[PDB]
Design a protein that fits this description.
Radius of gyration: 18 Å
Domain Ig-like: 1-98
Number of strands: 21
Strand content: over 45%
Organism: Homo sapiens
Structural class: mainly beta
Helix content: under 10%
Bound molecules: chloride ion
Keywords: Adaptive immunity, Cell membrane, Disulfide bond, Immunity, Immunoglobulin, Immunoglobulin domain, Membrane, Pyrrolidone carboxylic acid, Secreted, Signal
Number of helices: 0
Region (Complementarity-determining-1): 26-33
Protein name: Immunoglobulin heavy variable 1-69D
Length: 241
C-alpha cells in the first residue's frame, strides 16, 4: 500500500531556490531508492537524480550537478529535492518516484524503473524577460487494432542492456509504469501492453486499442553513465473516441 505524497506548488523568481518534499507511507518494505523527475509544461520527462535513503548516497544528471541537492530523512520517511539558482527552464512539475528492488527466487533485484510516483509539485519560475532517446511525436488510430510506439536510443542506453521501461501518462496525472526490463508488465497492468527491443530501438505494442489508451507514452532507459534517460514522448490519439 506504499504511496508518495509531495508538498504544494511554489512560485519563485529566477536566482532563488526551491525545496520540494516527498513523504512515503503505507508500507513496510525498505529496499528502494527515490528519484526525482521533472516535466516542463507540454513537454517530456527529464531525470534529475536520486538517492538511496539507507546510505544517503545521491547521484545526479551532469546537467544538474552543482545546483541540485537530494537528501532524505529516514526518521520521517521523507525525501527532498532542493534546486538552487532557478531559471526559466526550471518551470515544471517535479515528481518523486520509487526505484525499488523486488524479491523473487533470484533474491533482491532492481527493476531499474520507477513503480510508485508522487502526485507532482508545480514549480513556476516568474518571467524575467528571457535527447538520447527519440520517439515519434504522435500516432492516431481507430480502436480495436494493434499499434506500436518506437523509442530509438544509443548503444549506451537502450542498446546496452534490458534496463528499458515504458510509462503511460494521462492529463493531470503522474506517469504510470507499464513495462520494465524490456518486456515485463507490473502486476495489474493489462496484458494488452507488451514490450520488445532490437538493437538501439525499443518498442511498446498496444493490442486491442481502446479509447482509454489515449495518452502520452514515454520510454526510458538506464545508462552506462549511471543515469536515467527518457524519450521525447508519443501522443496516442484514439479516433472516434
Ligand atoms: Cl522568489
Ligand atoms: Cl497522480
Ligand atoms: Cl493497465
Amino acid at each position: 500500500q506504499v504511496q508518495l505524497v509531495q508538498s504544494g506548488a511554489e512560485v519563485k523568481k529566477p536566482g532563488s531556490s526551491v525545496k520540494v518534499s516527498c513523504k512515503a507511507s503505507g508500507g513496510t518494505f525498505s529496499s528502494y531508492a527515490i528519484s526525482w523527475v521533472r516535466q516542463a509544461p507540454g513537454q517530456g520527462l527529464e531525470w534529475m537524480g536520486g538517492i538511496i535513503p539507507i546510505f544517503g548516497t545521491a547521484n545526479y544528471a551532469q546537467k544538474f550537478q552543482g545546483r541540485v541537492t537530494i537528501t532524505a530523512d529516514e526518521s520521517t520517511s521523507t525525501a527532498y529535492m532542493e534546486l538552487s539558482s532557478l531559471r526559466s527552464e526550471d518551470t515544471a512539475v517535479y515528481y518523486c518516484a520509487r526505484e525499488p528492488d523486488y524479491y523473487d527466487s533470484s533474491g533482491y533485484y532492481p527493476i531499474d524503473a520507477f513503480d510508485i510516483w508522487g502526485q507532482g509539485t508545480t514549480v513556476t519560475v516568474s518571467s524575467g524577460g528571457g535527447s538520447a532517446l527519440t520517439q515519434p511525436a504522435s500516432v492516431s488510430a481507430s480502436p480495436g487494432q494493434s499499434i506500436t510506439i518506437s523509442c530509438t536510443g544509443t548503444s549506451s542506453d537502450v542498446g546496452a542492456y534490458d534496463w528499458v521501461s515504458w510509462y503511460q501518462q494521462h492529463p493531470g496525472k503522474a506517469p504510470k509504469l507499464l513495462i520494465f526490463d524490456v518486456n515485463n508488465r507490473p502486476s495489474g497492468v493489462s496484458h494488452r501492453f507488451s514490450g520488445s527491443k532490437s538493437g538501439n530501438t525499443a518498442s511498446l505494442t498496444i493490442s486491442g486499442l481502446q479509447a482509454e489508451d489515449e495518452a502520452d507514452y514515454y520510454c526510458s532507459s538506464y545508462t552506462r553513465r549511471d543515469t536515467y534517460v527518457f524519450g521525447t514522448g508519443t501522443k496516442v490519439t484514439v479516433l472516434g473516441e
